């Protein structure tokens, strides 16, 4: 499965976070994708956005939709999975189905220091405009 290079992926995601999948929510029959409630640990990018655009449950829980999206290589998860999520707030035309949800934009990444480092680096590199 061909996946875009880290640089482009970081460009196309206004929010990058880390967290553990607590539970699988309902399904989206129109796009054949699903949602899960995620307990965030820390944001590697876009925190300010989530703060102003997403209503948080439990102070540290969000809901990401878009899982199982064919156009993404690593798009599956299970209860307890830990990942680095490249997301974006759901557009309004995806409402009210995906209202107040962050939408998976690209392949999920495993929580390893190498990844955390590389992502942070690419995030900081681009933050140099």
- Tokens coding 73: 């290589």
Quote the least distance from Cβ 37 to Cl ion, whole Å.
23
Quote the least distance from Cβ 39 to Cl ion, whole Å.
24
Interface region with Cl ion, contact rule CB under 5 A, candidates 3-11, 31-39, 54-62, 110-118: 3-11
Quote the least distance from Cβ 73 to Cl ion, whole Å.
5
Q: Does 3 bind Cl ion (CB under 5 A)?
A: yes
Q: Are 17 and 108 in contact (CB under 8 A)?
A: no
Interface region with Cl ion, contact rule CB under 5 A, candidates 23-31, 56-64, 101-109, 111-119: 101-109
Strands 61-67 and 82-89: unpaired
Q: How many CB atoms lie within 10 A of CB 49?
A: 16
Q: Does 75 bind Cl ion (CB under 5 A)?
A: no
Q: Does 11 bind Cl ion (CB under 5 A)?
A: no
Segment holding 66, helix H or strand E: strand 61-67
- Cβ proximity to Cl ion: between 34 and 86 the closer is 86
Candidates 63, 106, 108, 109; binder of Cl ion (CB under 5 A) is 106
Q: Does 107 bind Cl ion (CB under 5 A)?
A: yes
Residues 92, 97, 98, 104: what is their CA dihedral angle, to the nearest 10 degrees?
-120
Segment holding 61, helix H or strand E: strand 61-67
Helix (H, G, I), strand (E, B) or coil at 87: strand
Using CB under 5 A as the criterion, which residues of the chain lie in contact with Cl ion when the complex forms? 3-4, 106-107
């Amino acid at each position: 499965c061909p996946e875009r290079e880290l640089q482009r992926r970081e460009e196309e995601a206004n929010v990058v976070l880390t967290g553990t999948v607590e539970e699988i929510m309902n399904v989206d029959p129109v796009h054949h994708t699903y949602s899960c409630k995620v307990r965030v640990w820390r944001y590697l990018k876009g925190k300010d956005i989530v703060t102003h655009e997403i209503l948080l449950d439990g102070g540290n829980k969000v809901v990401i939709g878009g899982f199982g999206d064919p156009l993404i290589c690593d798009n599956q998860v299970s209860t307890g999975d830990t990942r680095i999520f490249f997301v974006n707030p759901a557009p309004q035309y995806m409402w009210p189905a995906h209202r107040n949800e962050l939408m998976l934009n690209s392949s999920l990444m495993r929580i390893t220091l190498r990844n955390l480092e590389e992502v942070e680096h690419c995030v900081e590199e681009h933050r140099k405009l």
